[PDB]
Symmetry: D2
Subunit: 160 residues, 4 copies
């Protein structure tokens, strides 16, 4: 962690209609270390000798359950790359533990979903709702921006 | 005649659990000369129609009501294929017009069946689809488009 | 204009550092058809038998002068497609004359620029500056949003 | 050997006024055994180093200080190439380790001189680049990365 950047993945869970239009964004609500509330995207490390899309698979099931039916993007190209730095103010992304370089994807879920393990809740929000300050505020390490870049990428960032 | 046409090209695929492309589907139909051709899911975007709605419509037009396409959330296409009515100008050509086609990978998760003019829908592995035999039957440089689709899916073979 | 969608391009003109990082965006100032002032991206139709990347070149020269030295992307993949509808409220994009389907690109310009023809001025703004309310207010047909999508794509959409 | 490494790959290109790729540049190198091999610009992203900066650094590292690379404004790479330490897991492989490589097309706008580990900087049109001769000389499947790059550029050759 103090030595090299970590390969991560961020997956923005979304509900889409038939045309692929993003209908809702799914945010996880868990507690911070001190029992304060936060909101996050599906985010996690890639393992040695693990493929990225597999990590995507593994992380989705972990946060949402084995019947979430993700549509893992046919293509490896992420919509962006979020560079979480251990020092704030360098990139829009920050994580106190490590320097993490994440391939970020929008991942539609075709199945049913529930919060698991450390995930207390799973909230489906419209783009307008997801981009409420109250919501964004609850997000950490700059994931609120990554969220906004995800919406922007899907052509559904709200004007407010 | 005088305007370039907005088009989409949809590349249907069977993906596995991890979204990895295992099969692509190619529509077998006849040319006006009655010659054999393989094809992508392709056509005009209508006036006042959304691109993603046109993907839905052409998919259904070619593959059926229950193909259950996964239309990409983002309008960012994998490439742009510009069919010029003059050969050699771009990798792509169409005798009828200048068409600017927005190309997408479209996973199909349901039952798919050849409709209207299409004679059959053939699912082929990437290694299969890129065999000289099949490619040779693709028109207007759509063979190049398929390779671009595969290259973008991390599945262009050697 | 009343029968088929038109193929358009939008180019977001930017100043970058050596690291490729977007430092400023170039907004043109001009009149609306009505006399009001607006701010515009570089935007226009692709001509019959004209390649898209060539339409990009043509529109850059046309708005910014022949020595702007744009870096046309090697890749035909736009960062988005902006679908300007002749009806407001259908997409985030609106044009009162046409249905335009536009392939949008961020275009760094490497040379000196000067606002041409009906362009009154050229404004170089930092992302913060470009996303000032008043600025985005001045944009038309949802181009303020397309600008945000462009900044989002570049990883430079402002928090505030 | 407990970690996957964050990597970049750069495909250096000469584009015309319209961004059209006219030639790609291949770096010639020696194998450990001293066979001749050709290469893209690839190397690690150091801790606390931004991707775009590692991109500059490895381009400068290989093409000299005058290459004037056009690093893309967008952090979206044209693809993500996974060199597994085991062959055949993905199209790419590297016995040294597991490298998650972010691939970009990088237009070079200036003088590019071969420096250090490289012996020769070979500029080749796309049709030249995909000659089985050339590709053969590429390791870790970079021949396949080179094609994906060309394909993404609309310039993959029909042979
Ligand atoms: Cl995809
Ligand atoms: Cl994505
Ligand atoms: Cl985007
Ligand atoms: Cl049609
Ligand atoms: Cl449309
Ligand atoms: Cl669309
Ligand atoms: Cl492309
Ligand atoms: Cl796609
Ligand atoms: Cl048109
Ligand atoms: Cl125009
Ligand atoms: Cl065109
Ligand atoms: Cl110019
Ligand atoms: Cl739109
Ligand atoms: Cl609209
Ligand atoms: Cl809308
Ligand atoms: Cl772009
Ligand atoms: Cl505007
Ligand atoms: Cl030129
Ligand atoms: Cl090109
Ligand atoms: Cl890719
Ligand atoms: Cl690239
Ligand atoms: Cl490609
Ligand atoms: Na214009």
């Amino acid at each position: 962690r103090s030595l090299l950047p970590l390969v991560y993945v961020d997956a923005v869970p979304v509900r889409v209609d038939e045309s692929g239009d993003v209908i809702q964004v799914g945010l996880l609500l868990r507690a911070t270390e001190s029992g304060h509330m936060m909101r996050a995207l599906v985010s996690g490390r890639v393992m040695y000798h693990e493929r990225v899309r597999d990590a995507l698979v593994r992380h989705i099931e972990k946060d949402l359950g084995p019947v979430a039916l993700p549509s893992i993007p046919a293509s490896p190209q992420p919509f962006t790359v979020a560079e979480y730095f251990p020092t704030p103010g360098v990139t829009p992304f920050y994580d106190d533990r490590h320097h993490a370089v994440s391939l970020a994807y929008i991942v539609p879920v075709r199945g049913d979903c529930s919060p698991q393990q450390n995930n207390l809740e799973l909230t489906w929000l419209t783009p307008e709702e997801a981009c409420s300050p109250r919501i964004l505020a609850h997000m950490q390490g700059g994931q609120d921006m990554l969220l906004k870049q995800a919406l922007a990428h899907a052509g559904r960032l709200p004007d407010l």
